Nucleic acid binder design. Sequence first.
DNA 1: GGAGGCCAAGATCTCAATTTCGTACAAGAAAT
DNA 2: GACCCTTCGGGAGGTGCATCCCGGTCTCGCTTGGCCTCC
Lengths: 342, 342, 415, 235
Amino acid sequence: MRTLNFNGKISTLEPLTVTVKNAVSTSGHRLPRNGGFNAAPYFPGTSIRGTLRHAAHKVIVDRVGLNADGKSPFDLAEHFMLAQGVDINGEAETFAPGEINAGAELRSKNPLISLFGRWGLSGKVGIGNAIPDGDNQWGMFGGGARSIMFQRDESLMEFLETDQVDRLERLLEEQAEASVDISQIKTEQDALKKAMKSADKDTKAELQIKVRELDEKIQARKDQKQESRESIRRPIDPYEAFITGAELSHRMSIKNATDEEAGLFISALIRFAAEPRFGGHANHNCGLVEAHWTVTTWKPGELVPVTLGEIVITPNGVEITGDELFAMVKAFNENQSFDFTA
Amino acid sequence: MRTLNFNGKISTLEPLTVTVKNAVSTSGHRLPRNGGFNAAPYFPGTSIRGTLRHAAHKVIVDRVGLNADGKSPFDLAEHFMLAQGVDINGEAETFAPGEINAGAELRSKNPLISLFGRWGLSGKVGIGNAIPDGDNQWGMFGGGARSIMFQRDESLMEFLETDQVDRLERLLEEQAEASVDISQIKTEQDALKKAMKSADKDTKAELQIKVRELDEKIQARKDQKQESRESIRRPIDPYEAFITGAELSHRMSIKNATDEEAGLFISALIRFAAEPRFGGHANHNCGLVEAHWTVTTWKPGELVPVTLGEIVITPNGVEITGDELFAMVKAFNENQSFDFTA
Amino acid sequence: GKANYVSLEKVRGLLLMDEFTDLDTVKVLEKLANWSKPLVEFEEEYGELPAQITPEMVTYSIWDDIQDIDDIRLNALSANFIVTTHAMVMVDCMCNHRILGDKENMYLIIDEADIFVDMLEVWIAVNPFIGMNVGRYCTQWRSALLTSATLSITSTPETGMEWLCKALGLTSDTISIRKIFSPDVYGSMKLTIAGADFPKVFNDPKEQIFSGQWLKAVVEQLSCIQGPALVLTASHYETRMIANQLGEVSQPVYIQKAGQALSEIIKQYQEKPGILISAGASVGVSPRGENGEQIFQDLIITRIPFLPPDRMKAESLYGYLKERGYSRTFEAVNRNIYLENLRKVIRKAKQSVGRGIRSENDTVRIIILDPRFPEPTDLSSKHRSLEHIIPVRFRREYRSCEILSPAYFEEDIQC
Amino acid sequence: MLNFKPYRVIMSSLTPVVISGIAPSLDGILYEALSQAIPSNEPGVVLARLKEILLFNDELGVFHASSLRFGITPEQGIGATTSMRCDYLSPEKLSTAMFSPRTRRGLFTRVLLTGGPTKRRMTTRPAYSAPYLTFDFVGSSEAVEILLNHAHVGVGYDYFSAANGEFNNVTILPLDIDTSISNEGMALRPVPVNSGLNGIKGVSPLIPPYFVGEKLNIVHPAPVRTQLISSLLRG
DNA sequence: GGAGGCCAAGATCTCAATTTCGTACAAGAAAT
DNA sequence: GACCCTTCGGGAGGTGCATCCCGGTCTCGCTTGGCCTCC
């Protein structure tokens, strides 16, 4: 068992963005911040870890074998336990505290669960956050605005029947009237939210009620729009993302990694390199990354770690250089004693 | 017999978090604050002390090694004596309580117990809290959400048979039903919290007991779910951690230390640098640290520090500096007198 | 320099002829041709200073060099107590192997070494840790003595001089001594500091706008002074805004124009003491009178001279630590540079306070109008180091001080 | 043997302070610090060297070192926190790599962490988290500053193990009146009952370490005492 | 066939609730 | 083979629209006998 540290950089091919419920607020979309509003945003280790765990789950599904017409020989409980560590059945063998070698048999038979952990079983893999290199390297990408297709180019209107043209007329008049009414209501709402700043606690209750009621008024005003519930033409709030070519330092660790588990992890990185996507806004191709990792193992009691090799994920291929990385991959590919079932 | 004071900085390679029962409330996971929420949090010296005691125990077991049978020579009693410090078999040297300097035989024979005491025997290693130097060096990390794997990627639905695509449809319908029910139950619960705010005292106790009945009703609705038990589309609460690259100031000290005990401590530090992990959330690689410690000592007979060397733990290696530190480490390594047993 | 930074082949320009009818001290014209000696005594001879300024004698050999300049270097070398500028001691060790040879005949004494370091990072930069170089230089001599009035951040030697222990690379083992010597009875000092409530200095610092409320408060406190005072602002821009906002109700206001020379305002101020608003300046100077006496009972440090944030330094140091291999985040480097700038801020404000007292009989009223100066009672303030500008011997007066705009001055019943 | 002035030392509290019934006295902190500086567990030598840096009241048998008094600011005050020591039986601690558990049928007998002598000890201890800790003492300022800044001493209980009461930014300021033993008849430290100082009766030794020697009847101040930081800096 | 070794029950409950560091000047050169 | 002499003034916008919603966990800090294997 070796402790492998993948220390390396994620270069950004297309902006790297993520919406975490914690970070974002009503002020707009913000990246998860390194402890403060005026801090360097980091790409969370949670998103990277989930992407790699799903890549490893697909690696396992491929490695066992797609039988039938592509259906994998795994139930839904197994897929959830392998990819998210949640047992829907509850039949997962909960290791009562104090159990010696907790899950050692499960770790030996399920290298994936050993790597990415479960409830009551520590995951050997720790996927750290990707911290950017240098000031800036983040920006408000996306954005823009929905425009009515038929108000932009008139040729598409030759493809619309008369009744559909009158439908568009009614839809736009409805959008305008709803916009004016909702905007007046929102002006009242933001004046009320300005009255928050005069924060007398006794008033705050009456203001939260008097603003959530005005937001229900907004919802009801939208609900009576026969043609379109939502205004079709509207500016898109931009999302904060790491710019293209941004260098994000990444640290990943596998504690006490067997050659089988480390080979599974390297195969997960290999399959991730096919679709090296991190985060969301994949409609704008956000998340495409090329990443290079230096694998260094550290024998405990030795003052220095030794370098096993380098994993380079690039659009031109995966360069896994190093005798020990290939040894790990071959050992994982050649071990037939993994039970991923219940 | 020199008091080695190690003073130095821990730089946080990946966020440094810890769960403490008092610090964590229903409002969310917060670091220990030593005051209110506006105070500066500290990484407890207890977690670092436990980590270094575990590292020292690993050093001791490796130095002892295994028997000819391939089993560790330590039993449960000795293992808990060296790890937790509490006597389980009731067989320990109960020194007189008025003898400050007692246990010299046990201290010499067991340097681990000498550094980190057992019950009834004061230890000699005092670890401090990692005190941050800045003002905005902590934040809500992790969190995110446990996205349903099949609602995110559709490629993962080409690997499920229909009998499991219907178990997926049933588990999502169960999740939505249960979340609606729990939503209305929590709404009634919060209205009851409001009536506790009133505390008219006519029937406040009964209002509390019906709140308890409501939590039981939450657990009943959450046992009616017969496919899953927990909602899988769970927003993960963020945990509070020290930002990446946070300079935390650390004081450790071995008081009245033999060269053997100090060498054992330095070997524990060297082995800890193999996996320099403090605290939890190791799934997100949290706790990876690099730390430089200036090892000073007190001049014999005066109140002056003399610097003996530096212990620079980095991912690139452990840089022990100073000839006296090497002398201590060699003295601990070479001494064939330790009997880590009864 | 080179004589008074001059040459000898081309002195004939400033000999007698019609081109300039200076006349007056005609003797100088003929003696200066063979006046090998440096600038200072020129003044001791005469104050006239004819032929207009002649700061560098209407230009001389800025980098073109002179002939037989060696003789001046020899006159320095064989002379026992060599007095130079910090410029010569760094050119010697960076420019070329060694400008001035030495082997057991020379002993660096870097006085005001604090600014000898603070300027070191500007030459090219300390992005590659150029400091290390000069550190070996101090070692290479028999002994280098780095002293300063502000060679400390704290009153403790080994905690406060660690910026010297960490910038030049000299360490305890090779450090001969690390000590602070402060007199106990040296002068007197009344401290008045602006509290937390005091109006914020910068409404918006980035684009350098000074909040009008702070300007009004500062002019108000300036006009309340009943005697000559020395106002040490931080920027000449602050000097200009404060001069604009002042109505000159007080005795003559003397202003340091951007890029002016302080000594002209000094001698403007000796003839008629008044209120002197002079940003920058200082560098170890004092508007002392003719025989020598404290001619400004008040010294107003409007704002602590906080150094701007320097993205160039942050990105350069991050580049060097990324090529060297250290795994530190950019934010950590930003914090390190911020702390180093805070240390240089404390040193600069220690120089500012040193401009108040220069004799044992001096009695100075120090007026800090900055709302960010730590109050005595606010020990958890971010800038808690900033009371180290005050000497230890006046720290009682720091603890017993007048606060103009204090905060939470009520009585809390949960005592 | 050295001249001694009345000083007040105020330190920024970094960790909650577990008070062991009697308020931690500054002489006990200084006795731990000198027990480290000159490595010595023998009380006599450490006491002798403490007398060289701290004034010792012969007529009372106590050091001129007042008990802990929390300095509370208008922003942060004295708070009730719990110093919580929990045993963490990690999966690596519960592994055959470290120890040989008793075996039956190849199954390793799990450790009963719920109860028993091998349980997960959850030791909660009242701690007080105030922004500042202040002590009054009569002694050498440089020596006490050096000890408090560059020694592993905290305030309260189990700082050598639980790192409770870690402090930094030690500021020593001279006092005009000795408020280390007595203040208007109110005891500011553990004093003997015969001293005539009124306070809270208790059983303790007078001189440090406060867990050895015969524990005699003493009068000690309120274990938790709070003062405004402004009033403490007034001097 | 008496020693482990795992597992279920014991009735009660205290209480606490958050919105963004630092903004410059010099003086002085035998040069990189 | 020496200078000449360096231009004005205009005029600087208008609108539209700012989404829907999930879904917030297990624990456990103790002791005892009952039952089940089993040296």
